[PDB]
Design a binder for this molecule. Sequence first.
Ligand SMILES: [Mg+2]
Ligand SMILES: [Zn+2]
Ligand SMILES: [Zn+2]
Ligand SMILES: [Zn+2]
Ligand SMILES: [Zn+2]
Ligand SMILES: [Zn+2]
Ligand SMILES: [Zn+2]
Lengths: 261, 299, 97, 68, 185, 48, 157, 95
Amino acid sequence: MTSWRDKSAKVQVKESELPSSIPAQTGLTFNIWYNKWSQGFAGNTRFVSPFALQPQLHSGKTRGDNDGQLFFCLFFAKGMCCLGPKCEYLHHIPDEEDIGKLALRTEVLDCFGREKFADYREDMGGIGSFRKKNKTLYVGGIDGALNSKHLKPAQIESRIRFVFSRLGDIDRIRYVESKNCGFVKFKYQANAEFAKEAMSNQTLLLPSDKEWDDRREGTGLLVKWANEDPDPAAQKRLQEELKLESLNMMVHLINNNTNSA
Amino acid sequence: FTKSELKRRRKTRKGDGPWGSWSPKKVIRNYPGHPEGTTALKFLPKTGHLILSGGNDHTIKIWDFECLRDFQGHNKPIKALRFTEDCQSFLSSSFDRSVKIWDTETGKVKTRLHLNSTPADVESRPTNPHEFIVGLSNSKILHYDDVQTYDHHLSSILALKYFPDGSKFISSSEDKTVRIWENQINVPIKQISDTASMPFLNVHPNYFCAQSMDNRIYSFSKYKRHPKKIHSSAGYGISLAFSGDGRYICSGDSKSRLFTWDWNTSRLLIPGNKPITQVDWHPSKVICSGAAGKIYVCD
Amino acid sequence: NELHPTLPTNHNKTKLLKSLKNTKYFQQTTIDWVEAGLQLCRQGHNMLNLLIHRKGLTYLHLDYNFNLKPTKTLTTKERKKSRLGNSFHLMRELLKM
Amino acid sequence: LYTPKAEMPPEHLRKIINTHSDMASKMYNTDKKAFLGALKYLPHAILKLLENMPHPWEQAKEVKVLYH
Amino acid sequence: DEINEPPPNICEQCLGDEANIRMTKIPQGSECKICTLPFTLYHFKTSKRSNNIIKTLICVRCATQRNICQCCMLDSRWHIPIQLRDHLISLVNEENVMTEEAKNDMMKRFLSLKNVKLGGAQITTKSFFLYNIDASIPEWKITDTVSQLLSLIVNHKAKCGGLRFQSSELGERFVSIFIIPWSSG
Amino acid sequence: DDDEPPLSYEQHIENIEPLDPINLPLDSQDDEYVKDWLYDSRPLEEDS
Amino acid sequence: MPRIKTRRSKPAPDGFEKIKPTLTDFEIQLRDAQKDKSSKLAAKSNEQLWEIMQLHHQRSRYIYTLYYKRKAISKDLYDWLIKEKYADKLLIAKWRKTGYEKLCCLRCIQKNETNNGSTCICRVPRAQLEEEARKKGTQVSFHQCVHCGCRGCASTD
Amino acid sequence: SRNVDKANSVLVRFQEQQAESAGGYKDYSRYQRPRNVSKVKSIKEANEWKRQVSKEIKQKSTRIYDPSLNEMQIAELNDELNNLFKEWKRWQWHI
RNA sequence: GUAUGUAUUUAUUUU
RNA sequence: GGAGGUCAACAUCAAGAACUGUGGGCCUUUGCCUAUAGAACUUAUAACGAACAUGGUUCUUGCCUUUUACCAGAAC
Ligand SMILES: [Mg+2]
Ligand SMILES: [Zn+2]
Ligand SMILES: [Zn+2]
Ligand SMILES: [Zn+2]
Ligand SMILES: [Zn+2]
Ligand SMILES: [Zn+2]
Ligand SMILES: [Zn+2]
C-alpha cells in the first residue's frame, strides 16, 4: 500500500539501452527468417542477464491498473520493460487478490497470459502443463555464483531464500548439498510462474562482493519445472493434501447440488 | 450536459485538439572560429556545459557545449589542456616550456611550474592526490606538487595518464614503448614493447588502457586495423574512437576489436589539412578538433 | 492472332485489385513513379531473401542485381536441398529485368 | 455504406518500408509470413508498374499506388 | 462439414454476463492443445470493452470426450479441473476412472477420433529457534499467523525454524506447539 | 554494380531536379493550336 | 501537379512567399519522421507513424485556417497549393462538413474497414465514455486510435 | 570428389578467419590438441579445448566394453585411452 | 553425375 | 437541383439475324396463330478489345538417349 499502491511504476531501462537482437555468432553467417546463425554450431549459447528487478524500488502503478487488466508484464519480471508507467501490463509482485481475479483463467494459461502446453517439455522447459498444477521450481546451475566457494550451504540456502523470498510467499525451500539443486515451493501457481520467468539467468552474492564486477561472464542459473518428490514423506504429504482439498470442494458440490434438488 | 460545461471542460486536455491527452555516428555540428589549428580539447568534468580547446594561435577558446570566453597568455602553441575534478582549476601546457595553472573562478593565471628543458606536450591531473603529471620532449615525466622525476623513455614522451591504484602513471613515447610506472619507488613497474611511436592513449572509464601506433591500435590491461596511419577516446558504452591523419574516423567496439564504422570528414571550403588532432566524449556526443581550423561535433 | 480468337470471359468483371482494395490491409496514395520502381525492387529483394532463408539455405547469396550465387563450394546434399525450380528462378529473372 | 478509399501522405509508406528494411525482431513473425504471401501477386505488380513508364517527353509521372 | 456442424461447448461462467455476444468464427484455427488436429476457432470478448480476448483451445471432440469447457477446460457441470473430478469419482467405487492419455503424437492424434469417451466423462538479527513443528505446515502459514496475531528461515529436514524480526522491540510485542527461545549475539 | 544497395529515393533523387526532357522545338506559327498542351502528362484534363 | 519542381509545374502565385517559412517547418519535420529511427517494440513503431499522421493533419489545418477562416490568401494561391499536394483536398472537404470540424483523418470515419459497426472510438466524445465508464466505475480504457493517435476527434472536445 | 576436398577450400576457410575476428565462432571441432598445454590461453578457451578431449574419452570409453573381439586392437585402443586421460589430467592441472 | 548412414550431454531433479 | 469521380455494388454483352412486355383466338401452363408498345451496348471484309498473351487434353510432326523446357499445325 504505502509502498507500491501510491508510487507509480518507474522506467527500468531506457529504450535505446535495450540489448540488441541477433544473438552473437553462434554460427557462420546470420539468417533472416529464423533469427539464428547459419552453418556450424558454436559452443552452446547462454549468458547471464545484464538485468534484474528490484521489487520495492521499481514496481509501481501503471495503466493496466486503471484499465483493470489481469496479466503481468514479463519484461517487468525481467526488469527489462522500457514502457514504464505507459506499460499495458501490471508492474508489481503477484498478491492474493490479483490471483483472486485470475482464478478462473489460471487453469489454461500462466499468469503472463500465455497458453500452457500439455506435456511439460523434454528438459522441463519454459512453460508448464495445464494438466497438473506444479508449484515447485527446480533451481539448478548454482554456478551462477561462478566459482566462489562458500563457508557452508547456509550461504546458498540463505541467499536463495532472500532471493525468491521477495517474489512471493514461499511454502518451503530445500537446497541439496550433494547434488546442487534448490527446490522452491510457493502458495500459488502464479507466483511460481512469475518467479520462474524472473530469476532465470541470474547471478548471486552482494551488489558488491569479490568478483561481483565480473559477474556478467557467468553462465546463469537454470530455473526449470520440477518433477515430483520421490521420498515417502512428501508423498504422504501430497496424498493427504489432495485428500483434504477434495473433501473441501465436495462442500461446494453439495451446496450447489443441494440448490439443484 | 451543457455547452458551457463542455467548453470549459475541454481545455483540461493538455494539447488543443485532438491529440491532446486527457489526463553508427554522424555529423551534428561544425564550429569554425579558431585562427590556427586546434591541438587539444578537454571538457568540463562536472556540468558538461563547455569545452576548453587549445589552439595553434596560442589562445584558448571556451565553447559552450557559442563562444564564451578567450584565455590568452601563452606565447606559443598549446599542445595540451586538462581540467580538474575536485578543483576549479584548469592546467594548460604548451611548447613554451611552461605548465600554467588557471583559476576558473577569476580567470587569471595563478601558478607557473618551472624546470622543463623544452616543450611540454602532456598534462594529466592525478585524480585523488592533488598532483600534476607533465611530460614532453624532456624525455622525463615530472610529478608536480600542485616533487618526483621519472627517468625513463629514450625519446620524447607524447601521452601521459594517471590512475588511482598501481601504476599511477602510464606513459607512451617515440621509442615505441609504453611504461607502467610505480611512482613511490620511482621506477618502471612494467614495460610494454609490442608497438612497432605511440602517439595516443586513452583510459577506459574496466581499468585498462588503449594504446595507439601507426597501423595497429592495441589494448592493455587487439583491434583490427588495416593501414589507418597515422588520438583515441573511449565512450562509457565501450566504444573506442580512433582519429586518423588520413581524415578517416575509425570507430571500434572495445570488447571485440571489431571496427563497425569508418567515416571521412569533409575538409573545408587542402586535402592535406584534413585530419583529426584531438577528440573527447562528454561525461553520447563526440568532439573532434581538426587540422582544418574547425571543431566538429559527432552525434 | 487473327485466326484464333478468344472471346473472353463474362463474369471476369471482378478484378484482382477491386477485390484487394476492399480489405483493411491496403491503403491508397499518390507518389513519384521512379519511387514506386525502387520500392518494388526493395519489396522483391526482401521476398526472395525470406523465401531463400526460410527454406534453410543461407549460403546462396542474392546480390542486388538478382543474381543468385553460392557463397561456398557445396557438398552433394547441399546441391540436392538447394535445387530451386522454375518458379523462383523465373521470377528472379523477371525482377532482374 | 461504402465510403470510398482514404488517400494518405506518401511519407507514411516511406516510413513503412523504411522500417521493414532491417527487420530482425520477433515482432515481424507475421510480416515475414506476409511477405511470402505477396510473392504470389508480384508479377502483377511488375506488369502494372511497367505499363506506366513515363515516356520520353514526360519528366516524372505521378501514380496512385496501393500498398499493403 | 464435419468440423463445423457440432456447435461449440462453452461454460456459462467464463462467457460473461453480457446479454448478447459477438464472436468470431475462423474455419481453420490452431490445432488443439490436446489432439493436435485443426479445428474451427472462436474469439470473443466477455465485456464489449474488455481488453482480454477468449480463444477456445481444444476441439469439439477432444472436449466432448472429456465433457469439459473449451475456454475454461473445467468440467461442464461441476466447474472442476479434470484431474480432480476423476479423483472424487475414484473415491467412490475404489480404483478406476483415471484418464490415461496419449503420449507421443499419433497415439493422441489417433485417440481423439474414437467415440469411446473417457472415464470421468462417462458418468457425466534476533534469532528465535523453532521446534515442535509438524513437517507438514508451510512457512507461509506460520508468518501469516504471526501477522494476524500482530524475516524467517526454516529447515524441514530439521523441523527447526529460526526467526529474525526487524527489531527485538517486535520481540517484546509478540512476547505480548512452539519452542521459542530468544537468543542472538 | 552488384554491391551498391539501391539508393533511397527520399534522399538522393528527390532533391536533384528533373534535367529537362526531349520535347521538340515545335513551331510557334504553324502549331499555334497544339503547341500548348501537346506534351502535358495527360494532354487535356480540365476542359469542358 | 507533382510535389516536385518539374518544368511543367506552373510557378507559384503571388501570396506564396509569406507562408513559405511556416510550411518549411512542417517539411523539415517530415524529413525527420521517415529517417527510420529503429525500435524493437510495436507500440514504438506505430507511434512513429502517429507522428507522421498528426503532422499531416497540422499542416492541412494550417492551410484550412488560411483560406477558409482568415481568407489570408487568394483563391488561386490556394488551388495551386492543392494541385501541388501541400494540402489534402478530401480532408479539408470533411472539415467543411457539419460535425467533422476537428477530424483526424479519412480512415477514422471509414465504415467498411472496422470489423463490426464503424467509426473509431476515436470519434466518440469523452463526455459519454466517461458516462458508460461511470456505469462500470472501471474508469475508461481508451488512449489512442491505433490508426492515428487521436484522442477525441469529435467536435465538442 | 568427396566433401573432404570441398570443406577445406579457400572459400570455406576465409569466412572462418572472419568469424574469429568478428565473433565467437572458430569451432575447436577442427584443430587438434594443441600439443603443449601450458602454451594454451585464457580460461574461457581451454574450457572448450578440455571438453574437446572428454568427448573422445566418452566415445572410446564406450568403445572399450564392446564384445567385438579384437584383443590386440583393444590393447592399442586401451593405451590411447590412457594417453588421452593423462591429457585430461594436464588440461585440468593448467586450469 | 560426386552417395549414404550412425554418434556427437555442456549446465549434477529431493529417498 | 446541376457538373463531375483513374469510386463501389448489382444487372447484361455472340444469337432462328437472333430482344422484351402486352391484347385476342385454339390446344390443354407449355405451345401455335393473330394484334399492339418499347428496343441501351455489341456485330457484315462479322464483333464487346480498330488490340493480343499463356495453359490443359487429344492427335499429327520437328529436335532426338530419357523427363521438364521445347519445334509448328489442327480439334475441343
Ligand atoms: Mg530413369
Ligand atoms: Zn512493462
Ligand atoms: Zn482436438
Ligand atoms: Zn468456460
Ligand atoms: Zn485519425
Ligand atoms: Zn480514428
Ligand atoms: Zn481521431
